Design a protein around this ligand. Structure first.
Ligand code: HEM
Ligand SMILES: C=C1CC[C@H](O)C/C1=C\C=C1/CCC[C@]2(C)[C@@H]([C@H](C)CCCC(C)(C)O)CC[C@@H]12
Ligand SMILES: [Ca+2]
Ligand SMILES: [Ca+2]
Ligand SMILES: [Ca+2]
Length: 402
């Protein structure tokens, strides 16, 4: 397996890394900040220093076009993406699609969801038992964002078990064959769903976008439309859930910070920025491809290579954040690469922040005796190069606040 070089040897993307990657990240930052990882599916580079990561995000030599892996001899015949999602594109197609969908994630729009998000969270909390076993992931942290995304897009509730399964395979260490099958089922499901929406539209996002596409197919093609729906669905299942989980765990493991939040519940939005920094839910940005040689921290990555920007790593870089290993919900947050940076900056950043503060804020308000029901060392994490996420979180809710 892989380990960090230098003065300290820590497992990388195997072994102890899944439980707690943060020591490994620190050893990478200190001693190997531009690291080639000889992973099973092929080598991937990893940048972990904050200044390198932040600038890389605006370096066009680090492209989303996967054809850069190929010699020029082979790029001509090949599609620009495996699925035409904007996160897998460079400008101009990225610019067009982002501008288009960005129109539905305007500042007033997401906030007008607060009342419903709160009702969803409050309903979930009222349904949780006082001391029987609760997996806080499946029963709360997962449920809030999935319900919100289903309502925002107009996804049938009856189909949730099917598409939640396809979604999870795409984001973890599942075999390439399995991922290809999952994407196929999701593409088919959403294609069929859009066909049905044409005949009976609703007021939710997928109908609105289908209408745009119907009116002007050069602004949004049918295939782009399905790929957008797929991207938004998967983001709705696999991101915010781990802000909730990781943030809850941070409070559970830091009584001092939990006490500060209990004493000033209004710290919750500052607290959310701090959870995003301290245990970033998107651990490595999805892959970029070197379109030419690039040099970071004295290390040249050749053209044609795959590159992850290490967000969890960079957000604990002491060169950027003093005492980066300290959880401090009172920090006046600024910078931070947990939502990315530049043209692909998280489309859902406002929505995730709102979901996060509602879910975590209301949970601790409703159940101020919440506690883990296992030791910290018994917690199981997902194996993924994309997400830092608990597989389950055994808790005891304790009594509802009076
Ligand atoms: C919950 C915490 C979330 C985190 C930590 C997060 C993280 C990120 C990051 C790091 C990127 C940039 C990736 C890169 O440049 O390679 C990104 C982009 C993106 N995110 Fe989020 N995300 C979250 C929630 C969401 C939600 C709720 C949505 C639903 C709308 C969403 C939709 C998107 C989309 C569509 C992009 C692609 C944007 C573009 O290419 O222009 N995200 N996210
Ligand atoms: C969770 C997050 C974190 C970052 C954003 O919020 C959006 C998001 C997920 C959805 C993603 C992540 C980037 C690339 C993904 C994983 C796509 C794959 C590259 C599609 C091709 C899959 C395969 C293996 C069939 O060839 C499918 C859904 C996309
Ligand atoms: Ca119940
Ligand atoms: Ca309508
Ligand atoms: Ca500095």
């Amino acid at each position: 397996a892989l380990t960090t070089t230098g003065t300290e040897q820590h497992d990388l993307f195997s072994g102890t890394f899944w439980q707690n990657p943060h020591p490994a990240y620190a050893a990478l930052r200190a001693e190997d900040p531009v690291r080639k990882l000889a992973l099973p599916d092929g080598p991937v580079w990893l940048l972990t220093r904050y200044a390198d990561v932040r600038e890389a995000f605006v370096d066009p030599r680090l492209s989303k076009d996967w054809r850069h892996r190929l010699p020029e001899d082979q790029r001509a015949d090949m599609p620009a993406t495996p699925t035409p999602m904007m996160i897998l594109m460079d400008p101009p197609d990225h610019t067009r699609l982002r501008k288009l969908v960005g129109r539905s994630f305007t500042v007033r729009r997401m906030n007008e969801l607060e009342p419903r998000i709160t009702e969803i969270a409050d309903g979930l909390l009222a349904g949780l038992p006082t001391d029987g076993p609760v997996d806080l992931m499946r029963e709360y942290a997962f449920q809030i964002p999935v319900q919100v995304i289903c309502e925002l897009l107009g996804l049938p509730a009856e189909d949730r078990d099917d598409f939640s399964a396809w979604s999870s395979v795409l984001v973890d260490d599942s075999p390439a064959d399995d991922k290809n099958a999952a994407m196929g089922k999701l593409h088919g499901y959403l294609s069929d769903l859009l066909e049905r929406k044409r005949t009976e539209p609703d007021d939710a996002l997928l109908s609105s976008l289908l209408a745009v596409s119907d009116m002007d197919g050069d602004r949004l093609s049918q295939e782009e439309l399905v790929a957008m729906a797929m991207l938004l669905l998967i983001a709705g299942h696999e991101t915010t859930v781990n802000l909730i989980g990781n943030g809850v765990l941070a409070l559970l493991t830091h009584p001092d910070q939990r006490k500060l939040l209990a004493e000033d519940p209004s710290l919750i939005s500052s607290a959310v920025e701090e959870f995003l920094r301290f245990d970033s839910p998107v651990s490595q940005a999805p892959i970029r491809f070197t379109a030419e040689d690039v040099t970071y921290s004295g290390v040249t990555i050749p053209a044609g290579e795959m590159v992850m920007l290490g967000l969890a790593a960079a957000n604990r870089d002491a060169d950027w954040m003093p005492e980066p290993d300290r959880l401090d919900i009172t920090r006046d947050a600024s910078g931070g690469v947990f939502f990315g940076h530049g043209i692909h900056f998280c489309l859902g950043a406002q929505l995730a922040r709102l979901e996060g503060r509602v879910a975590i804020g209301r949970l601790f308000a409703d159940r101020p005796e919440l506690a883990l029901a296992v030791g910290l060392d018994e917690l199981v994490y997902r194996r993924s190069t994309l997400v830092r996420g608990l597989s389950r979180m055994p808790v005891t809710m304790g009594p509802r606040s009076a």
